[PDB]
Amino acid sequence: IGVVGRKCGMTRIFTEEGVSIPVTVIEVEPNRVTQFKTEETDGYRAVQVTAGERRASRVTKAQAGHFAKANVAAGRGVWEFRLGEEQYAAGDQITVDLFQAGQMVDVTGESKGKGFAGTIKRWNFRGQDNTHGNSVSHRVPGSIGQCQTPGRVFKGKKMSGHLGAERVTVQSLEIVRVDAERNLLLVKGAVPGATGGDVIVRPAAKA
Amino acid sequence: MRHRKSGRHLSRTSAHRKAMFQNMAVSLFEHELIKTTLPKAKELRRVAEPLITLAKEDSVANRRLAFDRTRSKAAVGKLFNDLGKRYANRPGGYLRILKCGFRAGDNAPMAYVELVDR
Amino acid sequence: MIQTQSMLDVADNSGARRVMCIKVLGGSHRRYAGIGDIIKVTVKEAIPRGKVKKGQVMTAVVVRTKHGVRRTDGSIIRFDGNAAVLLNNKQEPIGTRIFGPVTRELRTEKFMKIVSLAPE
Amino acid sequence: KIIQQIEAEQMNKEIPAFAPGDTVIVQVKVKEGDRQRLQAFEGVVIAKRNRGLNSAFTVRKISNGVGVERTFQTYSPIVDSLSVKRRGDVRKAKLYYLRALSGKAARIKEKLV
Amino acid sequence: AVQQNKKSRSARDMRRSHDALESNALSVEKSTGEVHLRHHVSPDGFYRGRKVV
RNA sequence: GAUGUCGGCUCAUCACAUCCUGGGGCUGAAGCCGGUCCCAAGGGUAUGGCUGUUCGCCAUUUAAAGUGGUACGCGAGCUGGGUUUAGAACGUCGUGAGACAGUUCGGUCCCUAUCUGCCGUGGACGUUUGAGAUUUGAGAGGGGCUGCUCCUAGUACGAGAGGACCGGAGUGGACGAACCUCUGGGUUCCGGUUGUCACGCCAGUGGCAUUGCCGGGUAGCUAUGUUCGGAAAAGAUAACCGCUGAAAGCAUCUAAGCGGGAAACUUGCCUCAAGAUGAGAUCUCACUGGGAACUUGAUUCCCCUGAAGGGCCGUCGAAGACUACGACGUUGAUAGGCUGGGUGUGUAAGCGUUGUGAGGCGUUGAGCUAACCAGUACUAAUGCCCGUGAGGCUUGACC
RNA sequence: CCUUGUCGGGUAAGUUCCGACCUGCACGAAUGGCGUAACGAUGGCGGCGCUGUCUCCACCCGAGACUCAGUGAAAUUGAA
RNA sequence: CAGGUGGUCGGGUAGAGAAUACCAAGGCGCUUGAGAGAACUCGGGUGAAGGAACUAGGCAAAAUGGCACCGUAACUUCGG
RNA sequence: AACCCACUCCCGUUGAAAAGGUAGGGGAUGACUUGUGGAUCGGAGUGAAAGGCUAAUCAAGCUCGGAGAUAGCUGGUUCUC
């Protein structure tokens, strides 16, 4: 099970020895439990976890009745986590305190999104020359396929289009500090997204 | 790509674009109502208001700073004497923009710009 | 130095004045060489008499560069001019006296010789 | 406000007030051979504050016939001391025009006594 | 490049099926009973029940 | 009644008759190295000098610098050095025009994409009453490389020289993804200055000269920077190694029975994924009016009724070609302004002085400050249209 | 022609270049033979300065491409 | 219809100058506009560390550039 | 520099243009450039010679006649049983 945070910025802290540790600061709202999916109706075994503060005009009556089976009184977003074996009942604030120092973690965000990218930026695709007789084609792609005998272009090719706001995870980062008073996790490394994004922090898969 | 970049080009070079917003302001402080184009009004409201904020403090150094960005005698005379004193207790937000139909020849959406008390 | 055909002088007494990089040793195609790496030089311009004659394949270590070295801090040392120190067949230096400063980052298993003659 | 509030706790005062165009002397910690010691590094300051944005400066020393310059992080636990031996007027905050000049041409002028 | 066969009546009319129109922003002025576009100045110069021009 | 020929660049895909790494019979294999042959296609597979060259010969590397198919891959993707029409000259042959599967200098590479093929991205409808939100995963992709040290241990091995297997610990290279805290790079913010025209003149300043030419530089974007990754393990096997054991009194890894077995295979890790027409699953919300015709899953019309919701519209966005997505509309901090900071730049003008003057000094860390942070209603975010009225019939379980 | 003949120089490495040998398949004296200062938008090599040519591209400024209103072609086509 | 067309006039400030930069007299805003600020194409600006490693070939770009004085090689038809 | 000419690169090729443009180049008091008016013509002129030019046409123009030239060669040849 993990915690849903929010990317806030990159800083740098010092060991008193002399080295610097690049640190990504993550704010954690305490996460309420919306419901608990047992294995008998649903097959699988999971929880629903919610971060707060959405205005009470934007919730539909389908949702507003859904956050009244438990008294969650919820805000933006509803995420789910698949867990092995645990017991969470009605509404229970899952806080930062699951983690300790050390503790290899996985962090999933989206990314910053670049609009419609050519093959050089998208696929790292070295281009033709600039002088020495070259026509209009200075950084176009090269050729696509072979001649007559397949006749077609072959699925999976590497053309160009839309660098991603796709969902990307970085894996096996480590926690530098856990702050329960200001609700922070400090993570040594890069965290996918823009500042002010949304971030999920799981304990590590490989470990 | 323009992530978090502010200001729009309007398909004019930068010396044109400087000398056009200097000229839409200097005609607004004569007639106090202008029928202009809608993206040219959204960027007029970031040039004209540091002239009205500046007018609230009379100085030889301010009347030279005012002349050096709206270069006209009549617009400097119209500030510091009428405006700046009329808006002496207004914390910002000196104009308003009212969308008004479309141009006949193109479809350029129009807008009015109008001083707020008049 | 940091690329093939990079002119760089030496920091040594017995050697020649200027040498030129021809091959960056190490991996499959290392493209750059920082401070503390083995390159292979040709001798391009010799003193009227030293020890090393003009036009000879030798082996050198890189000791100063204008791009800098970067420690575990933000703090970097950045010289001006590039500089190498020639080696023998075995990697031990040829000359006696090293000119100018070096860095402390070079001192290792095999290079306690030149940091003795260094003064830094 | 939250990374602006963490960054008040790493900052505990170590440095005096100084400008570009000054001849500082810097005492840095040297950990080698299982013994810590200091080392003096004296030159002329050419780049100043928030150079990334968390406060790093730069100082140019003329070594044994060879130039060298060194960029220091201010609130590091390596930059220990900082004294100011001389100061003058430069007018032009960044002195990168001294990576070319070398001798009597690179004399920092003295309007300021 | 040019085509190799011409396009029939079907494949010509299928192309222009996505090209229709829309105008939906009409609104009645509360005071004068005049019809105009939503969030625009009415042609007699009234915006939300106030003469502006 | 035209299928544009050699080499280079760009981009590739398959074969295995394997160059490297992985498993392994035999050796004229002491050890380190090897030679040779079976199994294996997962990832890799050099920069240069000289030539039009592929090829080659050299210099220096490396774990290794593989051999083929794909019109001897690839000109509606590039080049035009080679063969290359018209010019001109050499050597040879012909009395001559001229020629040579001999040399040498010069010489125009055309196209706006209709059909798959596609790589990205939406509209329509469907999923058997309609919505909002969260999900199982059938299936398909992405990835997969390796060196050098050090401990084991100068031990086994060997006259000596020389020197390991198995296991462990480090930190480099080539490739990839993310990300700006750092180290740098980057035009509209602040200075210096040259020619000239102007604002009535002096001061001050503003046009044009490629941003006039330059010094610096916030946000964003970025690599040459920063961090992370390639597994561990489990199954079923290949070559091979067997254990019991007959047929064939013995022998025999096989006929029955029972195991060990490699980067290949199937999971394992990251992503999309119910248009998976087999259209799945949970939770929660909405709607409980008549009448007539003709024919009764009843169909059709008339009238009242329009809910859950959604869409148009507006302010915008580290979302964007258009769309789509996301946040918000007075229940109000969505964008602009305003007030304090922060950052940058480098001590304004005006006055007062000093001097014959340009200048210095007090003026003085001054003034100005885009994209950043915090607060604040000062200006701008004011109805209408879609969508209805309890959800078919057969069987079984069922009061 | 055989041929990248052989020898020396220049480069870490030179089928081109420079200097010689002469074994001229097939040089040679007004279809001139060998030298030659100055001149070439002339052919071939080598060097200093210099650089986005290039390792390897990153960012900014204009005019198009994209969206909206007005006008509105072309080659091609047996039928889909 | 970015092409072609003989001859006179030709001010000011800098400059040797009818070159070049800003202006007077006089004349014009080039008969489709508005947006937004993707790839890619064209005409441009700056660049870390290297400095021909690119390529048939330093093609192209960058650099050099004024006036006064000092100073100047082999070679030669005695001018250069 | 005007002026005449056309050495290189890129753009253009359905061009703005049936041969230009923007940057750079060569000559620039003479074997120069050019305005007006005249002379030379089709197996015939002119030519510092390339088979070049003679009205966007040139190893012998353009136009009207001989002339419905000749084609063992291509293409086509129409209502039923």
Short mmCIF file of C-alpha atoms (C1' of nucleotides) in Angstrom, two decimals, chain F residues 17-316:
data_model
loop_
_atom_site.label_atom_id
_atom_site.label_comp_id
_atom_site.label_asym_id
_atom_site.label_seq_id
_atom_site.Cartn_x
_atom_site.Cartn_y
_atom_site.Cartn_z
"C1'" A F 17 26.21 -21.93 -41.86
"C1'" U F 18 28.13 -17.87 -34.39
"C1'" C F 19 32.55 -12.77 -34.34
"C1'" C F 20 31.59 -11.65 -28.74
"C1'" U F 21 29.04 -13.15 -24.15
"C1'" G F 22 25.95 -18.43 -22.09
"C1'" G F 23 25.99 -24.16 -21.49
"C1'" G F 24 29.34 -28.11 -22.79
"C1'" G F 25 32.13 -34.39 -25.43
"C1'" C F 26 37.54 -34.95 -26.89
"C1'" U F 27 42.66 -33.29 -26.87
"C1'" G F 28 49.46 -34.83 -28.51
"C1'" A F 29 44.16 -30.41 -22.20
"C1'" A F 30 50.05 -29.75 -16.04
"C1'" G F 31 48.46 -24.21 -14.70
"C1'" C F 32 47.54 -19.62 -17.92
"C1'" C F 33 46.26 -19.97 -22.81
"C1'" G F 34 44.33 -22.95 -26.82
"C1'" G F 35 42.77 -26.55 -31.12
"C1'" U F 36 38.37 -28.96 -32.82
"C1'" C F 37 33.32 -30.38 -32.92
"C1'" C F 38 27.73 -30.50 -30.88
"C1'" C F 39 23.56 -26.90 -28.26
"C1'" A F 40 22.17 -21.55 -28.34
"C1'" A F 41 19.71 -15.74 -32.44
"C1'" G F 42 18.64 -12.71 -25.96
"C1'" G F 43 21.69 -7.87 -26.31
"C1'" G F 44 25.99 -6.20 -28.61
"C1'" U F 45 29.15 -5.90 -33.08
"C1'" A F 46 35.61 0.67 -33.61
"C1'" U F 47 37.65 5.67 -34.67
"C1'" G F 48 41.38 7.30 -38.72
"C1'" G F 49 45.21 7.66 -43.06
"C1'" C F 50 45.20 6.59 -48.68
"C1'" U F 51 41.70 5.85 -53.16
"C1'" G F 52 35.34 7.54 -56.94
"C1'" U F 53 35.55 3.17 -54.63
"C1'" U F 54 32.91 -1.64 -52.26
"C1'" C F 55 37.50 -4.26 -51.55
"C1'" G F 56 42.24 -3.63 -49.73
"C1'" C F 57 46.92 -2.30 -47.29
"C1'" C F 58 48.43 0.32 -42.93
"C1'" A F 59 48.37 3.16 -37.64
"C1'" U F 60 45.92 2.69 -33.03
"C1'" U F 61 42.03 0.26 -30.12
"C1'" U F 62 38.38 -3.47 -28.10
"C1'" A F 63 34.81 -8.40 -24.58
"C1'" A F 64 34.29 -8.56 -30.16
"C1'" A F 65 35.44 -5.14 -34.53
"C1'" G F 66 30.43 -11.82 -37.91
"C1'" U F 67 28.85 -13.95 -43.04
"C1'" G F 68 24.54 -13.54 -45.95
"C1'" G F 69 19.10 -12.14 -47.93
"C1'" U F 70 15.79 -7.55 -48.33
"C1'" A F 71 15.25 -4.51 -57.17
"C1'" C F 72 23.79 -6.73 -55.20
"C1'" G F 73 17.39 -2.94 -48.88
"C1'" C F 74 16.72 2.33 -49.23
"C1'" G F 75 17.08 8.97 -55.28
"C1'" A F 76 7.58 10.78 -55.51
"C1'" G F 77 14.37 10.30 -48.40
"C1'" C F 78 19.48 13.28 -49.59
"C1'" U F 79 24.13 13.56 -52.40
"C1'" G F 80 26.29 13.24 -57.70
"C1'" G F 81 32.58 11.74 -56.50
"C1'" G F 82 32.13 7.14 -60.54
"C1'" U F 83 29.82 5.23 -65.68
"C1'" U F 84 27.69 10.44 -67.63
"C1'" U F 85 25.24 13.49 -74.30
"C1'" A F 86 27.21 18.41 -76.53
"C1'" G F 87 33.66 21.62 -75.30
"C1'" A F 88 39.14 20.77 -75.36
"C1'" A F 89 44.08 17.92 -75.24
"C1'" C F 90 47.62 13.43 -74.93
"C1'" G F 91 49.27 8.22 -76.62
"C1'" U F 92 47.84 4.96 -80.36
"C1'" C F 93 44.97 3.27 -85.11
"C1'" G F 94 42.79 5.33 -90.18
"C1'" U F 95 45.16 8.93 -96.50
"C1'" G F 96 39.73 11.49 -94.09
"C1'" A F 97 35.45 12.40 -91.55
"C1'" G F 98 36.52 9.84 -86.91
"C1'" A F 99 37.39 5.98 -83.13
"C1'" C F 100 39.57 3.44 -78.16
"C1'" A F 101 35.15 -1.90 -73.10
"C1'" G F 102 43.02 3.71 -73.06
"C1'" U F 103 44.09 8.51 -69.97
"C1'" U F 104 43.15 13.73 -68.26
"C1'" C F 105 40.26 19.35 -67.03
"C1'" G F 106 34.62 21.27 -67.47
"C1'" G F 107 29.34 20.06 -67.16
"C1'" U F 108 20.74 21.73 -65.03
"C1'" C F 109 18.93 15.43 -60.46
"C1'" C F 110 11.32 17.23 -61.83
"C1'" C F 111 6.28 16.36 -58.33
"C1'" U F 112 0.98 20.27 -53.54
"C1'" A F 113 0.02 12.39 -51.47
"C1'" U F 114 -6.18 9.87 -53.88
"C1'" C F 115 -6.00 4.36 -52.10
"C1'" U F 116 -3.41 0.21 -47.58
"C1'" G F 117 0.80 0.98 -45.42
"C1'" C F 118 1.19 3.08 -41.19
"C1'" C F 119 2.71 6.85 -36.54
"C1'" G F 120 -0.25 10.28 -33.57
"C1'" U F 121 -5.37 12.15 -32.47
"C1'" G F 122 -10.67 12.93 -32.44
"C1'" G F 123 -16.38 12.34 -34.25
"C1'" A F 124 -20.64 8.43 -34.61
"C1'" C F 125 -22.79 4.59 -32.71
"C1'" G F 126 -22.93 0.27 -29.70
"C1'" U F 127 -22.50 -2.62 -24.97
"C1'" U F 128 -30.86 -4.06 -23.84
"C1'" U F 129 -33.48 2.09 -18.55
"C1'" G F 130 -30.20 6.14 -17.91
"C1'" A F 131 -25.92 8.63 -15.35
"C1'" G F 132 -20.94 9.60 -12.04
"C1'" A F 133 -16.31 7.06 -10.28
"C1'" U F 134 -13.09 3.16 -9.51
"C1'" U F 135 -11.37 -1.41 -11.51
"C1'" U F 136 -10.06 -7.50 -13.14
"C1'" G F 137 -6.71 -8.59 -17.65
"C1'" A F 138 -7.87 -11.92 -22.59
"C1'" G F 139 -4.23 -10.23 -25.45
"C1'" A F 140 0.05 -6.87 -27.35
"C1'" G F 141 4.31 -4.19 -26.54
"C1'" G F 142 9.13 -1.98 -23.85
"C1'" G F 143 13.65 -3.82 -21.68
"C1'" G F 144 17.61 -7.68 -21.87
"C1'" C F 145 25.07 -5.65 -23.10
"C1'" U F 146 30.10 -5.75 -20.70
"C1'" G F 147 35.09 -4.43 -18.83
"C1'" C F 148 38.81 -3.68 -15.15
"C1'" U F 149 40.37 -4.13 -10.24
"C1'" C F 150 40.30 -6.18 -4.91
"C1'" C F 151 39.15 -10.31 -1.36
"C1'" U F 152 39.27 -15.68 -1.59
"C1'" A F 153 45.09 -16.86 -2.43
"C1'" G F 154 50.53 -15.77 -4.64
"C1'" U F 155 46.63 -21.13 -2.45
"C1'" A F 156 45.62 -25.88 -6.19
"C1'" C F 157 48.94 -26.69 -10.37
"C1'" G F 158 54.49 -26.70 -11.82
"C1'" A F 159 61.90 -27.95 -11.93
"C1'" G F 160 61.07 -23.06 -12.24
"C1'" A F 161 58.81 -19.40 -14.97
"C1'" G F 162 54.05 -18.65 -14.45
"C1'" G F 163 49.58 -18.89 -12.09
"C1'" A F 164 43.69 -20.39 -11.45
"C1'" C F 165 37.87 -23.00 -11.09
"C1'" C F 166 33.37 -21.89 -7.77
"C1'" G F 167 31.86 -17.67 -4.63
"C1'" G F 168 31.96 -12.25 -3.04
"C1'" A F 169 32.81 -6.98 -2.99
"C1'" G F 170 33.58 -2.69 -5.59
"C1'" U F 171 33.42 1.59 -10.07
"C1'" G F 172 33.95 2.46 -14.97
"C1'" G F 173 32.33 2.45 -20.49
"C1'" A F 174 28.46 2.20 -24.46
"C1'" C F 175 22.72 2.57 -24.58
"C1'" G F 176 17.89 4.19 -22.28
"C1'" A F 177 14.17 6.79 -19.35
"C1'" A F 178 13.10 10.83 -16.31
"C1'" C F 179 14.41 15.43 -14.24
"C1'" C F 180 16.66 21.42 -13.48
"C1'" U F 181 18.62 21.40 -6.84
"C1'" C F 182 23.65 22.00 -8.50
"C1'" U F 183 27.66 23.22 -13.03
"C1'" G F 184 26.94 25.76 -17.64
"C1'" G F 185 24.28 27.37 -22.39
"C1'" G F 186 20.31 30.41 -23.81
"C1'" U F 187 17.04 38.19 -27.72
"C1'" U F 188 12.48 42.35 -25.65
"C1'" C F 189 14.65 43.11 -18.02
"C1'" C F 190 19.04 46.62 -16.60
"C1'" G F 191 23.54 49.14 -18.29
"C1'" G F 192 27.73 51.12 -21.55
"C1'" U F 193 28.58 53.40 -26.17
"C1'" U F 194 29.00 55.19 -32.02
"C1'" G F 195 26.69 58.15 -36.39
"C1'" U F 196 22.34 60.98 -37.24
"C1'" C F 197 17.04 63.08 -37.03
"C1'" A F 198 13.65 64.93 -33.56
"C1'" C F 199 10.67 66.58 -29.00
"C1'" G F 200 11.03 75.33 -29.23
"C1'" C F 201 16.37 75.43 -26.97
"C1'" C F 202 20.17 73.69 -22.47
"C1'" A F 203 19.76 69.32 -19.68
"C1'" G F 204 17.27 64.83 -20.06
"C1'" U F 205 15.39 61.22 -23.51
"C1'" G F 206 13.04 58.50 -28.00
"C1'" G F 207 13.13 56.66 -33.28
"C1'" C F 208 16.36 54.13 -37.45
"C1'" A F 209 21.23 51.76 -38.38
"C1'" U F 210 21.02 42.96 -38.83
"C1'" U F 211 18.63 43.11 -31.43
"C1'" G F 212 23.31 49.47 -34.42
"C1'" C F 213 27.35 47.08 -32.05
"C1'" C F 214 28.50 44.87 -27.26
"C1'" G F 215 28.59 43.75 -21.61
"C1'" G F 216 25.63 41.03 -17.99
"C1'" G F 217 20.94 38.05 -16.94
"C1'" U F 218 14.95 35.94 -13.82
"C1'" A F 219 11.31 32.32 -15.55
"C1'" G F 220 10.84 28.48 -19.38
"C1'" C F 221 13.56 25.19 -22.43
"C1'" U F 222 18.01 22.28 -22.58
"C1'" A F 223 23.10 18.81 -22.07
"C1'" U F 224 28.02 18.99 -22.18
"C1'" G F 225 24.84 18.49 -15.97
"C1'" U F 226 21.96 15.35 -11.87
"C1'" U F 227 19.66 10.74 -10.59
"C1'" C F 228 17.86 5.90 -11.85
"C1'" G F 229 17.80 1.12 -14.94
"C1'" G F 230 19.36 -3.88 -17.45
"C1'" A F 231 18.33 -8.15 -12.10
"C1'" A F 232 17.31 -11.87 -8.02
"C1'" A F 233 14.26 -15.95 -8.20
"C1'" A F 234 10.39 -19.90 -10.08
"C1'" G F 235 8.78 -23.39 -13.96
"C1'" A F 236 9.15 -26.33 -18.28
"C1'" U F 237 13.52 -27.90 -21.50
"C1'" A F 238 18.32 -28.04 -25.44
"C1'" A F 239 23.18 -30.31 -25.81
"C1'" C F 240 25.17 -33.23 -22.21
"C1'" C F 241 25.61 -35.98 -17.13
"C1'" G F 242 22.94 -39.74 -14.90
"C1'" C F 243 20.19 -43.33 -11.01
"C1'" U F 244 17.31 -48.20 -10.98
"C1'" G F 245 16.33 -51.79 -15.18
"C1'" A F 246 14.78 -55.58 -18.52
"C1'" A F 247 14.26 -57.26 -23.59
"C1'" A F 248 19.38 -60.05 -24.85
"C1'" G F 249 21.16 -65.02 -17.30
"C1'" C F 250 25.89 -60.47 -18.28
"C1'" A F 251 26.18 -55.38 -19.97
"C1'" U F 252 22.77 -51.25 -20.81
"C1'" C F 253 20.60 -43.23 -19.05
"C1'" U F 254 15.08 -46.33 -21.78
"C1'" A F 255 11.10 -49.83 -23.48
"C1'" A F 256 8.18 -48.71 -18.22
"C1'" G F 257 9.98 -45.74 -13.95
"C1'" C F 258 13.26 -41.44 -11.56
"C1'" G F 259 16.33 -36.80 -11.47
"C1'" G F 260 20.32 -32.59 -12.54
"C1'" G F 261 20.56 -28.98 -17.15
"C1'" A F 262 21.90 -22.57 -20.56
"C1'" A F 263 21.79 -15.25 -21.66
"C1'" A F 264 17.18 -18.79 -25.77
"C1'" C F 265 11.06 -20.37 -23.91
"C1'" U F 266 7.04 -19.11 -19.97
"C1'" U F 267 6.18 -16.03 -15.85
"C1'" G F 268 8.98 -12.17 -12.93
"C1'" C F 269 9.86 -5.68 -13.59
"C1'" C F 270 7.62 -0.76 -16.65
"C1'" U F 271 3.39 0.87 -20.01
"C1'" C F 272 -1.42 0.48 -23.05
"C1'" A F 273 -5.41 -2.63 -22.55
"C1'" A F 274 -13.89 -4.92 -22.23
"C1'" G F 275 -14.78 -2.28 -30.31
"C1'" A F 276 -12.11 -8.86 -25.22
"C1'" U F 277 -19.42 -7.53 -30.49
"C1'" G F 278 -17.36 -13.28 -25.72
"C1'" A F 279 -18.58 -5.65 -25.46
"C1'" G F 280 -17.00 -8.24 -17.96
"C1'" A F 281 -17.12 -6.52 -12.14
"C1'" U F 282 -18.25 -3.34 -7.90
"C1'" C F 283 -20.36 1.32 -5.12
"C1'" U F 284 -23.68 5.16 -5.37
"C1'" C F 285 -27.51 8.40 -7.62
"C1'" A F 286 -32.07 9.73 -10.70
"C1'" C F 287 -37.09 9.40 -12.72
"C1'" U F 288 -43.87 6.31 -9.95
"C1'" G F 289 -48.69 11.51 -15.72
"C1'" G F 290 -52.79 10.94 -18.78
"C1'" G F 291 -55.72 9.80 -23.76
"C1'" A F 292 -57.09 7.94 -28.48
"C1'" A F 293 -56.32 5.26 -32.98
"C1'" C F 294 -55.23 0.59 -35.06
"C1'" U F 295 -53.37 -4.73 -34.78
"C1'" U F 296 -51.83 -5.90 -28.78
"C1'" G F 297 -43.23 -8.28 -27.52
"C1'" A F 298 -48.42 -4.06 -28.69
"C1'" U F 299 -47.58 -0.30 -32.25
"C1'" U F 300 -48.62 4.89 -33.30
"C1'" C F 301 -50.26 9.65 -32.20
"C1'" C F 302 -52.03 13.81 -28.86
"C1'" C F 303 -51.19 16.49 -24.22
"C1'" C F 304 -48.75 17.29 -19.61
"C1'" U F 305 -43.76 16.65 -18.11
"C1'" G F 306 -38.66 17.19 -18.39
"C1'" A F 307 -35.04 14.66 -13.20
"C1'" A F 308 -29.65 12.32 -12.43
"C1'" G F 309 -26.77 14.52 -15.41
"C1'" G F 310 -24.19 16.45 -19.93
"C1'" G F 311 -23.22 20.27 -23.81
"C1'" C F 312 -23.04 25.28 -25.79
"C1'" C F 313 -20.91 30.02 -23.50
"C1'" G F 314 -16.97 32.73 -20.30
"C1'" U F 315 -11.99 33.19 -17.38
"C1'" C F 316 -7.76 30.22 -18.26
#
